[PDB]
Amino acid sequence: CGESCFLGTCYTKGCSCGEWKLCYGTNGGTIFD
């Protein structure tokens, strides 16, 4: 996900801020940056 979890929380639902400070979407088991 082209997110920006600068603080920690991401905006796009499903996108979780990964350790490498990058939110990855995991909606319905579907993983996408």
Side-chain angles (χ1 to χ4, degrees):
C1 303
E3 268 292 313
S4 299
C5 52
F6 184 51
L7 302 177
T9 42
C10 316
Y11 293 62
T12 307
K13 178 187 176 183
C15 306
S16 306
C17 191
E19 183 182 60
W20 42 52
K21 201 166 186 57
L22 292 173
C23 310
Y24 271 57
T26 332
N27 284 301
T30 314
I31 308 176
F32 46 79
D33 197 0

